[PDB]
């Protein structure tokens, strides 16, 4: 990118609905990366006095100058991000206060950044709409629902693993499940597996994968789930 | 992003906006691209139809009111007819009720009243669809651009869609040739293929992706469909 | 009135409301009926928790829309009555209107009908209650047996059940009834819907009530005598087998 | 608790309503108009911000007309604005069928003044985020007024509002204090493009179009007409002779 | 839950949220006003602010009349005020309509309070952010002032006042109740009535008037009238000559 | 929780978005426009072998020249039909002939927007537009046999063959290949079968698939069970050949 002069995003923008594995490329670009990885908790950060959230902010980027090349992660940034406004909790204040550290210290008045920064959360909702507003954030990837075609690499990454039978076409498992999230596609093939000790089986054939359709996806769809639950709150 | 009031049209942003009269105008923006523009005596409308598939058909970009005066279609398409119908009552009101043709500038006080109600009010939705309406009246041809936020404004030609307004560049430049030109009709609505050409990304204009209607003094309102535009390409 | 819509579609395609209301049906009694070839029977069972209920002035769980066809429901109690009273309206006015006795066919689409209204009108909610409608057409002396769902879908059954215990009731249905060879006696309709019924109401005697629906306008209800006597046959038959 | 600024008919613990102070907000993003008051009637002036070269010049009408003699214009939202002047005509008609003759300027504020509090005592609908000045001759001497998004309204002998409502209105200051016995309604047409020039360090970015309508009984004899000919360009070389 | 001070509902306090909130809208414009009974009359005081030198002071006033026999004062916010105006008037003429004869002044205050209560206990309208002040002389109890509010709840007062220092006002003209023990001005003439609660609002108020600084309502024996500026100002040169 | 009406920063409206969603959790309906005439099929899907085929009916009738099927949530199915029905049948009464197949589709497809909340100016009272999905089939005297679909979005397009439901994708991108100008009747019945075989859970027989047609004399038609059966048959011998 230095032939044609520009500026690469500092930020990025990972939210998407809960389920999709989007901890695993948080985690996948840490291992091409071959550097120091820092993963910072939402909770972390609000400590047990009042002001030490704002010490907490410091410490983060003050290892960006004394460990170059290295990339920052926060998880679950909505316990953090502010905009809370004020009207009837009356102590809402010490939350926004981490975030007014944490913007000053990313843009500040001297343009001090060198390394990217990560905001994951759940609810993109609440979240500063300030926070949302470029600058401090450039690319922005929003995890959807995989289709028919997308969620089928989800069974094949899947088949390298457990034991598979010869000639069983996973288009069809996907396609009589509806959209879900990652996290339950994984649990069709882990369920799987267990029908063969009580069924009393030799391994997992197709006749064992279309219970798990009624089991993991029709048998679970009692709450302990979302699966586009939350769009907003 | 989606934040503050998403709720309802009746109440108002601390920055004196609207969010959802903001975000039907992405409709239009988002919506399928047209272009327009006018001469003393003829106005002509140019319109690029899309489809989500190549065995499928393409809908009319432009619905007929009457003889003498016509509109086109952007951005939402199925609340087109709800406008084209209200529209069309008036029309037909004035000839049986004063005996006279709605003239092009009375048109777009009549549309601006009926999506002003649903704005100002609990349960109504602005319509999200552009209109661009063309005709001839005693006083000479003219063009409006119409939009959900309520503004109507003559102007010579305009494009509404998406990335139409990366044409209104050659309109700009040839303002001083196509309003000099009358009783030209062939020469005319070539002016208008040359600019929609300038907003053309991915595939270019073919016959069933090319939609003109023109409307004059001596040719009234005729919609060229199929191979009828296959002259001007 | 209430103009505020209550359904709203899910993210996943799905509708709140239509989803847990069906719910309410697995939580309540369970309806059970098979069509032999010239009857059909229709059986439901009765709660245990509450006793010293007058059997006289109970109302019956299996309600007689007309003559010719019968209506059984299941789950809440309360909602199925607004689907009888209406439903036995239509009895009277589709008499009135075209001069012809309803048959089993209108009188799921009817009912069914109306369920979609709630569902599509604004300020209502859909009802919790799954239906049973069952009975004998005009000059017809081949059993129409219909399911009604609270989504709205109708469908036809040989043998089916709904209520509490429901898969456990089915693929009881699935393997000792064959639906292309149904029994040709009312006898062995009235023993398949008590063994059907051994595996929710857990040997009990006045919670079952059974109601056999036959053509030319008969209806027999069975009384707590009656059932004990199928009852007995087949304890005899069950552990001895 | 939060939630104040939700709704409408919800009154805020100081005693405001922030349905009302956003619709303030929204009348300075608009196009700016002023007016001035004479003794014989009132004069309207309003500056069209135009955007590209493919307006048509003169085919916007900013200053939309009720009845004859009463002129109204408007700075804030498009829709809001007609919908005033839509309803105020409805008003004008309905009088003049019950009471003939026409209704002066002064009852008429008090139709869009009720008209528009309506809005802001039910949920339901919104309030007017458009600030209207309207005002003509009436049958007693001549009145101007403002109607503001709140509905409160009073007596203007001069009215300045929209993006350049800051310096304008410190304009209509001097006017006054020069001509404090009374101004001409021919005067008058030349210093309200003046002023306009004098705000426009605001607009200054984008092109501007002069519009101005006024109405008295010297010359048009209680008649509200726009300036055409050249009254208009005029006007022009007088006010940009001081710049 | 959090919901209980925006809509009006039983608190956990046993309160009204927004009843509470709709007096502190009512001294939004900051207006002391005053009215004292005379013998056969009853005279009114107004504090007049002009804020801005473009608004006419002759368009400009918080003092209605509804009817000839009875005068109206407004302390608070002109749309809600004028929307509160409208309304009593078309009360005020349906009683001579209807019941043939004029409305009282303890009538018209029991109606209005009715009707803000429809206001109040509606969740889907607001309370008026203006206190009704009805100042007339009935056939019957002769000179009364019965004063309503945004609750509904009118009450008649000997001296009523209004405003911020309403507090001062009240305690001031307390004393002189208290000491004469008398109910009303035993001033015959309603000349003397409006030099007497001038006296009492300058001291109490610490503020030297002037013509256009005040107005001054007078309720007389079947007619009512609002004084001029030249009036007003008659009446505080006397004022100043004598005392 | 909130509007119907409320729009989404993407520039379309909530709601309706989610039931172009919700066509997908049904069964698929494919469909195939020729010049010869229009071959219609759907899918039953029976959850136990207990169940009829004769019960559930996914093909209606509109009109003798006119017909079409559903597919997802047949609980807004229904309701279209009685109007579909009637604004077809009603339309003979005025003008005294058959309302064309794109007239009747612009008038159906008007269903979808009546969604609100307390409307101003008339009265429209609906809680939720119709979440199914209807291919509206026919033929006329201009333009010839057409088949549309009715989106829940209120739109619609003419398809020469369309597959909806969970085939929306892996069963339409065979259509593209697979369809002809000259493809006749009879090559067309199997054709649509031969996708339906691929894309069904279970096997392919009379009890799991009802089809039916459309043709310029006889109109709408639905196979009977003995003619799909004849059509399974020869199914096999068009699949393994060389």
New interface residues.
């Given amino acids: 990118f230095a032939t044609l002069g520009i500026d690469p995003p500092k930020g990025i923008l990972l939210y998407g609905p809960p389920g999709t594995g989007k901890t695993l490329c948080a985690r996948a670009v840490a291992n091409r990366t071959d550097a120091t990885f820092i993963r910072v908790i939402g909770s972390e950060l609000v400590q047990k006095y009042v002001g030490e959230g704002a010490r907490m902010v410091r410490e983060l980027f003050e290892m960006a100058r004394t460990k170059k090349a290295c990339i920052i992660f926060f998880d679950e940034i909505d316990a953090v991000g502010g905009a809370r406004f004020d009207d009837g909790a009356g102590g809402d204040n010490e939350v926004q206060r981490t975030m007014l550290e944490l913007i000053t210290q990313l843009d500040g008045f001297d343009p001090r950044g060198n390394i990217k920064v990560m905001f994951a959360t759940n609810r993109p909702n609440t979240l500063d709409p300030a926070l949302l507003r470029p600058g401090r954030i450039d690319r922005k990837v929003e995890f959807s629902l995989p ?3 997308g969620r089928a690499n989800i069974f094949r990454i899947h088949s390298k693993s457990m034991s598979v039978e010869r000639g069983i076409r996973w ?2 498992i996907s ?2 499940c ?2 879900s999230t990652g996290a339950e596609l994984r649990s069709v093939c882990t369920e799987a597996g267990m029908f063969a000790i009580r069924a009393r089986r030799k391994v997992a054939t197709e006749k064992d994968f279309l219970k798990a359709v009624d089991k993991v996806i029709s048998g679970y769809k009692k709450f302990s789930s979302t699966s586009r639950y939350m769009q907003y709150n | ?2 934040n503050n009031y ?3 049209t009746v109440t108002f942003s601390p920055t004196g906006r609207l969010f ?1 009269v903001e ?2 105008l ?6 399928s691209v047209t272009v327009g523009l006018r001469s003393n005596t003829h106005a002509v409308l140019v319109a690029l139809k899309r ?7 393409y ?1 009319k970009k432009i619905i007929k009111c009457d003889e003498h005066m016509g509109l086109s279609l952007a ?1 939402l ?3 087109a ?2 406008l084209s119908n209200y529209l069309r009552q008036q029309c037909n009101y004035s000839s049986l009720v004063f005996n006279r043709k709605l003239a092009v500038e009375r048109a777009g006080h009549l549309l601006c009243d009926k999506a002003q ?2 704005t100002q ?5 602005p319509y ?1 669809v552009g209109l661009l309406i063309i005709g001839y009246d005693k006083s000479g041809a003219h063009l409006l651009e119409f939009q959900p936020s309520g503004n109507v404004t003559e102007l010579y030609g305009t494009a509404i869609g998406a990335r139409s307004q990366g044409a209104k560049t050659y309109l700009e430049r040839t303002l001083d040739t196509f309003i000099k030109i009358d009783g030209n009709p062939d020469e005319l609505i070539k002016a208008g293929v040359e600019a929609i050409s300038q907003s053309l990304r991915d595939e270019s204009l073919t016959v069933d992706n090319l939609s003109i209607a023109i409307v004059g003094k001596d040719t009234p309102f005729t919609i060229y469909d199929g191979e009828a535009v296959a002259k001007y390409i | 009135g209430y ?13 709140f409301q ?1 989803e847990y209301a069906l719910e309410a049906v697995k939580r309540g009694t369970c309806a059970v009926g098979v069509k032999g070839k010239n009857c059909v029977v229709l059986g439901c069972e009765r709660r245990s928790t509450l006793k010293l209920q007058d059997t006289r002035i109970t109302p019956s769980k299996v309600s007689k829309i007309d003559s010719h066809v019968v209506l059984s429901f299941s789950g809440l109690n309360a909602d199925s009555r607004i689907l009888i009273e209406k439903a036995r309206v239509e009895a009277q006015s589709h008499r009135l209107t075209l001069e012809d006795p309803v048959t089993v066919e209108y009188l799921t ?1 009817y009912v ?2 109306v369920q ?2 709630y ?6 909610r859909p009802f919790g209650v799954s239906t049973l409608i069952a009975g004998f057409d005009p000059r017809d002396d081949e059993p129409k047996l ?1 399911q009604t769902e609270p ?3 109708y ?6 059940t709904i209520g509490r215990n429901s898969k456990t009731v ?1 693929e009881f ?2 393997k000792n ?1 064959d ?1 292309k060879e149904p029994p040709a006696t009312v006898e062995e309709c009235v023993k398949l819907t008590v063994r059907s019924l051994l595996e929710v109401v857990q040997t009990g005697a006045k919670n079952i009530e059974i109601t056999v629906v036959k053509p030319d306008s008969d209806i027999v209800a069975l009384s707590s005598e009656e059932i004990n006597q199928y009852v007995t046959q087949i304890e005899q038959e069950k552990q001895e087998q | 608790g939060t939630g104040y600024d939700l709704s409408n008919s919800v009154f805020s613990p100081d005693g405001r309503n922030f349905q009302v102070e956003y619709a303030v907000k929204a009348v300075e993003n608009g196009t700016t108009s002023i007016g001035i008051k004479c003794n014989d009637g009132v004069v309207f002036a309003v500056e069209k911000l135009i955007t590209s070269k493919l307006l048509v010049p003169q085919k916007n009408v900013k200053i939309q007309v009720v009845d004859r003699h009463i002129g109204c214009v408007y700075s804030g939202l498009i829709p809001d604005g007609r919908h005033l002047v839509n309803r105020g005509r409805e008003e004008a008609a309905s009088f003049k069928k019950l009471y003939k003759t026409p209704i002066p300027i002064p009852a008429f504020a008090d139709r869009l003044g009720q008209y528009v509090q309506a809005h802001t005592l039910y949920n339901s609908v919104r309030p007017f985020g458009v600030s209207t000045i309207f005002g003509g001759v009436d049958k007693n001497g001549a009145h101007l007024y403002m109607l503001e998004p709140s509905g409160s309204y009073w007596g203007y002998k001069g009215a300045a509002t929209g993006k350049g409502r800051q310096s304008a209105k410190a304009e209509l200051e001097k006017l006054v204090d020069h001509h404090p016995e009374g101004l001409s309604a021919r005067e008058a047409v030349k210093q309200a493009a003046k002023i306009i020039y004098l705000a426009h360090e605001d607009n200054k970015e984008k092109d501007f179009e002069l519009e101005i309508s006024w109405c008295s009984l010297s010359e048009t004899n209680g008649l509200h007409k726009f300036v055409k000919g050249d009254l208009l360009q005029e006007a022009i070389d007088f006010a940009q002779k001081e710049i | 839950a959090g919901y209980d001070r925006h809509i009006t509902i039983f608190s956990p306090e046993g309160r009204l949220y927004q009843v509470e909130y709709a007096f502190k809208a009512t001294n939004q414009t900051n207006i002391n006003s005053l009215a004292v009974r005379g013998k056969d009359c009853t005279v009114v005081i107004s504090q007049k602010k002009v804020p801005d030198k473009l608004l006419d002071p002759t368009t400009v006033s918080y003092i209605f009349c509804i009817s000839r026999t009875i005068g109206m004062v407004v302390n608070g916010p002109i749309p809600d005020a004028r929307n509160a105006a409208l309304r009593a008037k078309a009360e005020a003429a349906e009683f001579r309509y209807k019941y043939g004869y004029d409305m009282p002044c303890d009538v018209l205050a029991k109606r209005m309070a009715n009707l803000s209560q429809i206001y109040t206990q509606r969740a889907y309208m607001r309370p008026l952010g203006v206190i009704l002040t009805f100042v007339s002389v009935d056939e019957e109890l002769g000179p009364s002032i019965y004063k309503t509010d945004p609750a509904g709840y009118y009450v008649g007062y000997k001296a009523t006042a209004t405003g911020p220092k309403q507090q001062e006002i009240t305690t001031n003209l307390e004393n002189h109740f208290k000491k004469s023990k008398i109910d009303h001005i035993n001033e015959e003439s309603w000349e003397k009535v409006v030099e007497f609660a001038i006296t009492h609002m300058i001291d109490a108020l610490g503020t030297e008037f002037s013509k256009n600084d005040l107005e001054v309502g007078v309720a007389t024996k079947d007619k009512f009238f609002t004084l001029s500026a030249e009036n007003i100002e008659e009446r505080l040169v006397a004022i100043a000559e004598q005392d | ?12 409206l909530f ?1 309706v978005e ?2 172009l ?5 049904g069964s698929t309906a494919i469909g195939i426009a020729t010049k010869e005439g229009v071959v219609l099929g759907v899918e039953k899907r029976a959850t ?5 085929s ?3 009916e996914k093909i209606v009738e509109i009109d003798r020249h006119i017909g079409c099927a559903m597919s997802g ?4 199915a ?2 279209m039909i009685e109007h579909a029905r009637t604004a077809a049948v009603t339309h003979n009464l005025y003008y005294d002939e058959d309302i064309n197949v794109e007239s009747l589709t ?1 008038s159906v ?2 269903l ?2 009546r ?7 008339e009265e429209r ?4 537009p119709f ?1 199914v999905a209807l291919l509206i089939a026919g033929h006329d005297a201009d333009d010839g046999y057409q088949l549309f679909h009715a989106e829940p ?10 597959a909806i439901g ?1 085939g929306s ?2 069963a ?1 991108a065979e ?2 290949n697979e ?1 002809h100008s000259s493809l006749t009747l009879k090559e067309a019945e199997l054709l649509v079968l031969k996708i339906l075989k691929q894309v069904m ?1 279970e096997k392919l027989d009379e009890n799991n698939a009802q089809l039916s047609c459309i043709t310029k004399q006889d109109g709408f038609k639905i196979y009977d069970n003995e003619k799909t059966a004849e059509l399974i048959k020869e199914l096999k011998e068009k699949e393994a050949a060389e």
């Fill in positions: 289709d028919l075609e288009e069809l396609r009589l509806p959209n | 992003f989606r998403d709720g309802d959802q975000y039907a992405e409709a239009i923006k988002q919506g489809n989500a598939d190549e065995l499928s058909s809908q951005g398409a199925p609340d007819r709800v109600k649903n009010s609990y349960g109504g939705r999200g | 103009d505020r819509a209550l359904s709203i579609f899910s993210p996943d395609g799905h509708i239509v689409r069914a009908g979609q209204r569902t599509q009108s604004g300020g209502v219909y989504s709205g879908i469908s036809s059954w040989s043998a089916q089915r249905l699935e009834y639906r | 929780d909130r509007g119907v009406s409320t729009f989404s920063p993407e520039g379309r709601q989610y039931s969603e919700a066509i997908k959790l136990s072998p207990l169940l009829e004769d019960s559930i949530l047949t609980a807004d229904r309701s612009q497809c008007d979808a927007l969604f609100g909340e307390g409307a101003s100016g009272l609906m809680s939720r979440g979005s209120g739109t619609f397009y003419r398809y020469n063959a369309k969970s994708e892996g339409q259509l593209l369809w859970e």
